[PDB]
From a paper:
Among the L. pneumophila type II substrates, ChiA is an 81 kDa endochitinase with a novel amino acid sequence at its N-terminus and a putative glycosyl hydrolase 18 (GH18) domain at its C-terminus. ChiA is composed of four domains (N1, N2, N3 and CTD, from N- to C-terminus) which have structural homology to those associated with other chitinase enzymes. Using chitin binding and chitinase activity assays, we show that ChiA-N1 is a chitin binding module and we confirm that ChiA-CTD is a glycosyl hydrolase domain. Lastly, our structural and biochemical studies demonstrate that ChiA-CTD has novel peptidase activity against mucin-like glycoproteins, which is independent of its chitinase active site.
We readily obtained crystals for ChiA-CTD and its structure was determined using iodide single isomorphous replacement with anomalous scattering (I-SIRAS) phasing. Electron-density maps were refined to 1.7 Å and the final model contains two identical chains, with all molecules built except for the N-terminal His6-tags and adjacent ChiA-CTD residues Val419 to Gly424. Each chain forms an anticipated GH18 α/β-fold and is composed of 11 β-strands and 13 α-helices. High concentrations of 2-methyl-2,4-pentanediol (MPD) were used as a precipitant during crystallization and we observed four MPD molecules in the final model; one bound to the catalytic Asp541 and Glu543 residues (MPD-1) and one within a hydrophobic pocket formed by the α5 helix and α5-α5′/β5-β6′ loops (MPD-2). The chitinase active sites of ChiNCTU2 and ChiA-CTD have high primary sequence identity and tertiary structure homology and modelling of chitotetraose binding indicates that chitin lines a negatively charged valley on the surface of ChiA-CTD. Chitotetraose overlays with MPD-1 in the active site and the MPD-2 site is positioned adjacent to the reducing end of the modelled chitotetraose. However, L. pneumophila ChiA-CTD also possesses unique features that are not observed in homologous structures. These include an additional α-helix (α3), an extended β3-α3 loop, an extended α6-α6′ loop and an extended β7-α7 loop. Examination of the ChiA-CTD structure suggests that His544, Asn547 and Gln595 are ligands for the zinc, with Asp504 the general base. Furthermore, the MPD-2 site which we observed in the crystal structure of ChiA-CTD may also represent an additional glycan surface to accommodate branched glycan structures.
Numbering used by the authors: 424 to 762
Write the structure that this text describes.
């Protein structure tokens, strides 16, 4: 499995040897944003991150992925809204060609191993959940074309829970990444779930789980389960109204994502889930056996074995906390030894 760290491109990054020693296997450079003047062009917003620094990561054995989108941009004539630049293009085909060429250019120039979809704005639902049109169809085409041309690319999705949790919804918030996953699963290294900055969302049991309380793994386990299982139309004689999500993902394509605390307990993301709970979530997904080192009340419908690992937003917090997030999770996330 994997220990994944987000590296903000507006802060001095930790040394590659510090990250490798802590147990990091992958880092995610935040962020590429979207040109409003050449629709499809990706504008690098990581001034603190050099090709030399990325070489240092590779020399330490860490893979380096370019994260696209994010929450906002301050670069003039840029947006983090995908739809906005897709519709600004002369055609969806021109947009796709420009986006692919621009992404290939950045990958070649910086030596990236792949790219991450952290597109939090402007993945609007069109067509049907099972046969999406518009934004999801175009993004799926970009992902599947990039992977078809280079099956070594690490292509990841980093959804918010509303985007992937069992839902009747299909819009820019609800179920959009679940729809995208059915179109792209064959191309994806992993889907990393943002288990923070969210209200509760539904498990396939029709129970609404949120990140608090953080002393049980239920939320982490239920959200991973929502990606690993078909969404049922009926639960115990009742209609769910759930979209017809069919799971095509392997456990190795599931990553659970959290905010890392600094030494003071501060974080960029709320709430902070302690590493003891994260290990319980992985042990629970592995075994589907409840206990004080494994499942709480929520037990998934089967044992999955080892999932894909863990990420944190973001490594400058973890560094300040002597890399306790990576150090405490690496035996569990990487070697699958969680109790």
């Amino acid at each position: 499995g994997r220990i994944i760290g987000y590296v903000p491109g507006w802060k001095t990054p930790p040394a590659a040897q510090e990250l490798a020693s802590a147990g990091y296997t992958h880092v995610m450079i935040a962020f590429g944003v979207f040109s409003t003047n050449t629709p499809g062009v990706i504008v690098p917003a990581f001034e603190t991150i050099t090709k030399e620094y990325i070489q240092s990561l590779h020399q330490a054995g860490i893979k380096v992925i370019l994260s696209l989108g994010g929450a906002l941009t301050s670069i003039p004539n840029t947006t983090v809204d995908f739809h906005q630049v897709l519709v600004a293009s002369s055609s969806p085909e021109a947009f796709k060609q420009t986006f692919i060429n621009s992404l290939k250019e950045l990958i070649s120039q910086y030596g990236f191993d792949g790219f991450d979809t952290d597109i939090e704005h402007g993945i609007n639902a069109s067509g049907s959940f099972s046969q999406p049109q518009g934004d999801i169809a175009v993004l799926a085409s970009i992902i599947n074309t990039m992977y078809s041309q280079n099956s070594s690319l690490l292509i990841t999705l980093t959804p918010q829970v509303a985007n992937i949790a069992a839902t009747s919804g299909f819009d820019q918030t609800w179920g959009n990444y679940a729809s995208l996953i059915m179109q792209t699963h064959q191309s994806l290294a992993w889907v990393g779930i943002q288990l923070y900055n969210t209200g509760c969302a539904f498990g396939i049991d029709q129970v609404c789980y949120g990140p608090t309380p953080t002393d049980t793994p239920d939320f982490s386990v239920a959200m991973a389960t929502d990606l690993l299982e078909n969404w049922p139309a009926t639960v115990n004689g009742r209609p769910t109204g759930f979209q017809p999500y069919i799971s095509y993902l392997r456990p190795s394509q599931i990553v659970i994502g959290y905010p890392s605390p600094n030494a003071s307990g501060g974080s960029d993301g709320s709430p902070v889930t302690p590493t003891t709970t994260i290990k319980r979530a992985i042990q629970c997904l592995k075994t589907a056996i409840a206990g004080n080192t494994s499942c709480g009340v929520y037990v998934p419908p089967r044992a999955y074995g080892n999932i894909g690992g863990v990420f944190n937003w973001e490594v400058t917090y973890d560094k300040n906390n002597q890399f306790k997030f990576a150090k405490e999770l690496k035996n569990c996330a990487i070697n699958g030894v969680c109790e």
